[PDB]
């Protein structure tokens, strides 16, 4: 009597898989009532997904309603999770499972099958190129010099523009092009670059000027930005 | 004139659903050689994450993030472009802001004139009713032939309706306790399980090393079905 798990697999964020339970040594009741999945995310515990319950009600976790199915095929004597729509967060091992079903008093579940792994990624990072910002943050006094370094991890010529952005409100464009001033920009910012490192400074700190600051590469699309530098008061 | 570009279409979604953004733009026309809108995101206290860039080509640009799933497009006779947002995920909760760029590989291509941004919520809608179990020790170490204790906590009354399994590493769970106290087929009675109120105790009489493994309590008073959080216990 077990349970066997097979579909996993590789997806990208909105893809679709299929998992199928075969039971072996038993026959599935009514509907397969009592099937269940369950799933664990790397290095996390168990989450309840799905059963198919009596007076064909099947239950189902919020976290998957409305993309994933539970059925079964008793003519089959498998049973199934449709998952649609997937997303990063279903990565896990997908786990069927025989819910107790003869007694009230008992729903716990048994004959676990050995899992199938499901993975949602739209990749590693690849060929992208990485923006390292340093600091990530500073605290400052008005009227200190403040410098912001940025790295490429290729070359990017000096295809390179930085950004303003203050709480609550829209990125602003302060340098292109490694150091050339945007309109409306005050003096005392200015941008450079040595190697692979740009640099941003703020000559004397004004109290305007706290606010995160973001590089930006455009040599190459996808269009990176470093994880920003926050520019706080002492 | 000053460029304005104003989003709208924002709100609240739920995961596997759609929805589409508009950037409105005034101040020059999208038709212009050399011009570009770009959608941009920022989730909550996180930075900026490019996601789509109109170009001139019949092929526009995207993120692999959200390729396959999202569409960039403008409509030219209302001066205002698009993103068409599909099959969405928690993970897409963000301020989407559009901007200003170029449509060719120009040496000083920026983004510029970016918007007040319009937030996208991917919510399920639901929770506030779910039975929470709290498991503690969330670890513990102890040697062969102790008696160790392993609690979880209901956030509810649920009757008797607990279950205990336990995790070998690299298998899947077993049963050992279910119904409170009932012991599952194959499983020795150097294990039990009682229950007082809401506080519910696994304990492990005559600790073996093959009990290395990690154990969950799990109630099924009512759906959805929920675990506690898991204790590994170590055997030294």
């Known amino acids: 009597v077990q349970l066997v798990e097979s579909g996993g697999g590789l997806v990208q964020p909105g893809g679709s898989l299929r998992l199928s339970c075969?039971?072996?040594?038993?026959?599935?009741?009514?509907?397969?009532?009592?099937?269940?999945?369950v799933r664990q995310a790397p290095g996390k515990g168990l989450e309840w997904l799905a059963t198919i319950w009596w007076d064909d009600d099947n239950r189902y976790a919020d976290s998957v309603k409305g993309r994933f199915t539970i059925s079964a095929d008793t003519s089959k004597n498998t049973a199934y999770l449709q998952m649609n729509s997937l997303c990063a967060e279903d990565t896990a091992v997908?786990?069927?499972?025989?819910?107790?079903?003869?007694?009230?008093?008992?729903?716990?579940?048994?004959?676990?099958?050995?899992g199938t792994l499901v993975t949602v990624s739209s990749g590693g990072g690849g060929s992208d190129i990485q923006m390292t910002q340093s600091p990530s943050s500073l605290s400052a006094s008005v009227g200190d010099r403040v410098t912001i370094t940025c790295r490429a991890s290729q070359d990017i010529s000096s295809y390179l523009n930085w950004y303003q952005q203050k709480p609550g409100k829209a990125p602003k464009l302060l340098i292109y092009?490694?150091?050339s001033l945007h309109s409306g920009v005050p003096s005392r910012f200015s941008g450079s670059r040595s190697g692979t490192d740009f640099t941003l400074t703020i000559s004397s700190l004004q109290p305007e000027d706290f606010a995160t600051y973001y590089c930006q590469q455009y040599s190459k699309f996808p269009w990176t930005f470093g994880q920003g530098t926050k520019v706080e008061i002492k | 004139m000053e460029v304005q570009l104003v989003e709208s279409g924002g709100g609240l979604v739920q995961p596997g659903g759609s929805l589409r953004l508009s950037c409105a733009a005034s101040?020059?026309?999208?038709?212009?050689?050399?011009?570009?809108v770009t959608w941009v995101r920022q989730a909550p206290g996180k930075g900026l994450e490019w996601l789509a860039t109109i170009w001139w080509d019949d092929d526009n640009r995207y993120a692999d993030s959200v390729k396959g799933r999202f569409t960039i497009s403008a409509d030219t006779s209302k001066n205002t472009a698009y993103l068409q947002m599909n099959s969405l995920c928690a993970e897409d909760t963000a301020v989407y802001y559009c901007?200003?760029?170029?449509?060719?590989?120009?040496?000083?291509?920026?983004?510029?004139?970016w918007g007040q941004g319009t937030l996208v919520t991917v919510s399920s809608g639901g929770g506030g009713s779910d039975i929470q179990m709290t498991q503690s020790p969330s670890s513990l170490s102890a040697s062969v032939g102790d008696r160790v204790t392993i609690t979880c906590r209901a956030s509810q009354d649920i009757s008797s309706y607990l279950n205990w399994y336990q995790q070998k590493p690299g298998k899947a769970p077993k049963l050992?306790?279910?119904?409170?106290?009932?012991?599952?087929s194959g499983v020795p009675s150097r294990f039990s399980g009682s229950r007082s109120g809401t506080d519910f105790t696994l304990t492990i009489s005559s600790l073996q090393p093959e009990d290395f493994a990690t154990y969950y309590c799990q109630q099924y008073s009512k759906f959805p079905w929920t675990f506690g959080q898991g204790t590994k216990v170590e055997i030294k």
């Open positions: 092009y490694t150091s």
């Open positions: 901007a200003q760029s170029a449509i060719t590989s120009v040496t000083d291509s920026a983004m510029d004139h």
């Open positions: 101040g020059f026309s999208l038709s212009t050689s050399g011009i570009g």
